[PDB]
Amino acid sequence: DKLNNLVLFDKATYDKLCKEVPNYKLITPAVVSERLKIRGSLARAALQELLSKGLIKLVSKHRAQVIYTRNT
Amino acid sequence: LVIPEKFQHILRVLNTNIDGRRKIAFAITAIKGVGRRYAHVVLRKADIDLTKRAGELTEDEVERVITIMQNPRQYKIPDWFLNRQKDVKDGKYSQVLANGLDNKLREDLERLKKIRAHRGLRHFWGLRVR
Amino acid sequence: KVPKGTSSYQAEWI
Amino acid sequence: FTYRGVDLDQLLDMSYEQLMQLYSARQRRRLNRGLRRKQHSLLKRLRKAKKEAPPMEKPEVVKTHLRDMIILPEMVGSMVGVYNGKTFNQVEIKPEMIGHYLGEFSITYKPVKHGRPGIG
Amino acid sequence: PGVTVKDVNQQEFVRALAAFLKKSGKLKVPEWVDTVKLAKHKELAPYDENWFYTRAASTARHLYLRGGAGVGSMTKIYGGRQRNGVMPSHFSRGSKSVARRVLQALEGLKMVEKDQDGGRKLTPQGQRDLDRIAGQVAAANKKH
Amino acid sequence: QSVQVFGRKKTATAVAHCKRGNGLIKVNGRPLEMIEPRTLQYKLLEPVLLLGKERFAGVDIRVRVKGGGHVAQIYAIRQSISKALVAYYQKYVDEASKKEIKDILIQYDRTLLVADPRRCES
Amino acid sequence: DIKLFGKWSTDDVQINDISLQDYIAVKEKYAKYLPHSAGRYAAKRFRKAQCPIVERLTNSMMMHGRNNGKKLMTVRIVKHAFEIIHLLTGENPLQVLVNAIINSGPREDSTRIGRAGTVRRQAVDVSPLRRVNQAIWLLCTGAREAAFRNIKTIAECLADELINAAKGSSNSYAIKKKDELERVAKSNR
RNA sequence: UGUCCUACGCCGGCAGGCGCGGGUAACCCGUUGAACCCCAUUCGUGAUGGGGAUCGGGGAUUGCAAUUAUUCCCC
16 A cells, blocks of 8 residues: 655644654654654654754764664 | 644645645646746745745735746746747747646647648657657 | 549558 | 738738748748758749739649748748659648648658568 | 865855855846756756855855866866766756856956956955955864 | 875875974865765874874875875875875884884785775776 | 774674684774775685675675665765664674674575486585675665665664664564575475 | 867857857867765655656757758757
8 A cells, every 4th residue: 555644743743753752762764754654854854853952862964864862 | 843724735726636745846846837947937936935835835825826827927937938939829928737738739739630741640640750 | 532632642641 | 810920911021031030940040041042943933823823713733842942921822742752742832831841741651551471 | 363265174165155145245146046047967946045156155166276267167167967868978067157147246246356367266355255254164163 | 304205096196295394184285184085084094093193293294186086096195195104204213113103004904005006907 | 992983892892603703804903994995805715704894794785786886875874874773772883783694694505416407405504704795695685675665764774684683583684584595404404 | 089179258048159369289178177976955655856758839050951850958
């Protein structure tokens, strides 16, 4: 079957992003895109937002692979 | 980002279905007679945020995109970007749209039949032009 | 059914 | 009938330099370059043959080998035979077929209908 | 106070230059900017709304690094891969008009000098400006 | 007071110019950290990271680079740095130190002193 | 002291197998700053044993058609992979890699003995070097196959593969392949 | 490689025009300013922006001649 991803957020999604995501050990736009059925763009945006808020650490920023860490 | 309450999941513009969840400049491209470049040009002339999704709009903006799209030369989309340049009929530099294209290629075909040209005869056969 | 002036050679196209 | 928002009467009475602006690019180029001697001769012949005709009747057909000839608005009305390598094709020049060449009317090859193959 | 252009992260320097160009306000911007391509080899219009500034900055940098460049030279710089469809790919030069209008614009701002040599090089004022921007970037890198 | 060596990799030739300075290593007018393939940045910094800034204390090196690709150029550059240093140690410093440095460098990577003999075959 | 990528320790790396203690080279003298070294290792026979294991891995990751020359790409993949591994386990990524290599390589193999036509193969013992090489190949192939048509990155996928083969679980492709070969080699005899 | 190779200015969205120079050549094109690659940006596993066939309109050269699309350009 085809893959249906949410291009914009839902309340269930938002809660599972603000609470659940900053405790994944490895946080990757691809992993978050796979865990919660999100498009890679939206997931990336979310990650960026979370970085800006100061909830999630950054490992390496690249053109292809951007890696993130749960705080403590 | 956030959750938009006024979100159009399915769009219908010019008797053609547009996927609202898709990115704007690549969602207009879905209709016939509008490529990507042209869409981009429109959206830079419309003064609308390019990062926005197609469902992530007001109605007025959409209507003005429609307005620009219909009458391109008036909104300073200059005379080369248009689909049909010097028409054989009226000689008006006008960009053709969804159904219009179907009408006009058909018209061209008819005229080429009528003339009894070589291209026309090839097209009648079901063969290659170039 | 063939047009008025056209020849046998071009007739094969019609 | 209308061609580029211009009628036949206007077209005929129009300047030669003004047609170098109301055609397709190729044709414009050709008209800038100038009509060759042979072409001129052909045109003159056409002018003669349309002039020396009964008003009710269709003009007498002029045979030609020039398939590199562009159809001008002055040729509309005349019947021309164009050689396709072997045989002539008597073609009535319509108003619709101005922005074309005479060649695309008399086809130079027979279309292919396949015979059943031999030892391959 | 002794830093130079060459000793700075190039991309960042370019960015900063672009920013400077923007915040100054004065630069000759053509009206076709939201419509134009950038080469026959490229596919779409550029993503950046203020791309012209960036390109100008880049041009300036190039002039600084290597003098005696013309419009042809600038076209040869900004060229790349023409996707020839099903035919194999070749190299094609950039858009001549765009470069030409960059160089005319920067020259208007007294940043670029038209030469006795042939092409175009850089003014002293322009050079000074460049080195100021390099200092700015440097301070915002060694302390950051 | 000054030494001028070359390192060649593939087509890329890098000429290093060693002189009594204050500890500056500049390649074609820009620092070693400011060279574009920063994925391959460590390879260029190997002669510095191995022997320390303490051996590069009062030596100014200017590297002139020409030819090849990018990786090849890098390899040439690094080579010519190492070779340059070795030659300087030979000439104006003692032999034992030179021997030591050379030993260190061979013991880390052989390419760092002796050139790759292979180049594009017809 | 030499650190891989300027951050990874090599003195903590412990080889479990005595057989591969000679042929996986990473411990002390072979430890290098970057995977990319571009020295000749195909010059003479057995020389690719003296080549660093990370480097070897890199060289087998660019193997595929469209990627056939691009080594910087490969090294970036490897680096990011290592980072991912570190994030995941907390363990030294080189150690993990070594473990994977140990647990991926086949020990016995069925091979054609007789003539062309006699389809009964005899199960034979496997060289240590070959076991390493084969292991590497399997791992890279797994990485490829997990990362073809999905949102998952090769660095991520490769890391996943390597951790799965390090732990010894039956989620790795390489492990599966080993199991399939090994059972066959237990069947032919 | 080169007496058509072309530098440089101007007019050009783009092919290109217009002006002016150098090179019968380790001199000028030409530090041959290449592409991959690298570095950031957007896209997110779908016939998708991958892929570009096939087609519809223009424009520009080349040439005695481009109609059976010379070739290039833009939709």
